[PDB]
Design a protein around this ligand. Structure first.
Ligand SMILES: Nc1ncnc2c1ncn2[C@@H]1O[C@H](CSCC[C@H](N)C(=O)O)[C@@H](O)[C@H]1O
Ligand SMILES: O=S(=O)(c1ccc2c(c1)CN[C@@H](CF)C2)N1CCSCC1
Length: 257
């Protein structure tokens, strides 16, 4: 976790959300695939509620585009204040925010409700009430009296756990830790890197725990969920760029029972 002090948000984004991994024009891309998982899961209108919490938001919002139209109270979090910062920048259309419009549009495109994308970036910005600091290794990630509405009706996390835990055991605990935040019967949308062990972010060189679809599932069950849906996307050769060594990406729709 010490390494996370050299984390460069602008380089993280550059490494992962700007072409090639960021080109949403090719259907076979990982961008389209991920946004599609989210779209379809929420489209089933089974993941509803008043509040929602996004764990380890980092400096990204794509993970919330389809969600934002289902929960009025959205809470975004992250360790690094540097990330909580970059988030704010886009939340207040401040100077030099990252441009997510291409992602916004591909959410609207995929959702097919004919929504204009400026309208989606509006609904999101509006529904995100707070950007809180968080530590998944803590038995109570947020803190004691967090401004966050608990328990949340739903959880969303992307590439967090496997990137902050040094091994499967650390990973499982971290999972159980955030699971506490989820109301019983609420939903979890977990995205992540399969069999990855490192990834760059400017100066920083972060360790990752290579995990598998079975390890991730077995661990989801172990944490107390009833695995609703679990998909795997194999990273094509053209999306390997030495910013990391990821093999594929996983999507999980879990339900705390
Ligand atoms: N102890 C901890 N608890 C929670 N998040 C942590 C953490 N230590 C580091 N992080 C954050 O976990 C993130 C991993 S990168 C993932 C960013 C974003 N979720 C995306 O979808 O791309 C970083 O933003 C990092 O700051
Ligand atoms: O699969 S991605 O290319 C992606 C997105 C983010 C990350 C990785 C990969 C791998 N390293 C993670 C840190 F360990 C961060 N994709 C980028 C476009 S939006 C959906 C996610």
């Amino acid at each position: 976790a010490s390494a996370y002090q050299r984390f460069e948000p602008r380089a993280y984004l550059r490494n992962n959300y700007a072409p090639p991994r960021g080109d949403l024009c090719n259907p076979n891309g990982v961008g389209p695939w991920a946004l599609r998982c989210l779209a379809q899961t929420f489209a089933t209108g089974e993941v509803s509620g008043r509040t929602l919490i996004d764990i380890g938001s980092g400096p990204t919002v794509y993970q919330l585009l389809s969600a934002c139209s289902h929960f009025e109270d959205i809470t975004m979090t992250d360790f690094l204040e540097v990330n909580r910062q970059e988030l704010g920048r886009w939340l207040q259309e401040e100077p030099g925010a990252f441009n997510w419009s291409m992602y916004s549009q591909h959410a609207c495109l995929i959702e097919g409700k004919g929504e204009c994308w400026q309208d989606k970036e509006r609904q999101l910005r509006a529904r995100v009430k707070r950007v809180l600091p968080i530590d998944v290794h803590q038995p109570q990630p947020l803190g004691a009296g967090s401004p966050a509405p608990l328990p949340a009706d739903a959880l969303v996390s992307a590439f967090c756990l496997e990137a902050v835990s040094p091994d499967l055991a650390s990973f499982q605990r971290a999972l159980d830790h955030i699971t506490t935040l989820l109301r019983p019967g609420g939903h979890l949308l977990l995205i992540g890197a399969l069999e990855e062990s490192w990834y760059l972010a400017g100066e920083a060189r972060l360790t990752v725990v290579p995990v598998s679809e079975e390890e991730v599932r077995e661990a989801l069950v172990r944490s107390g969920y009833k695995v609703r849906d679990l998909r795997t996307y194999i990273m094509p050769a053209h999306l390997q760029t030495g910013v990391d060594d990821v093999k594929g990406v996983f999507f999980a729709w879990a339900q705390k029972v």
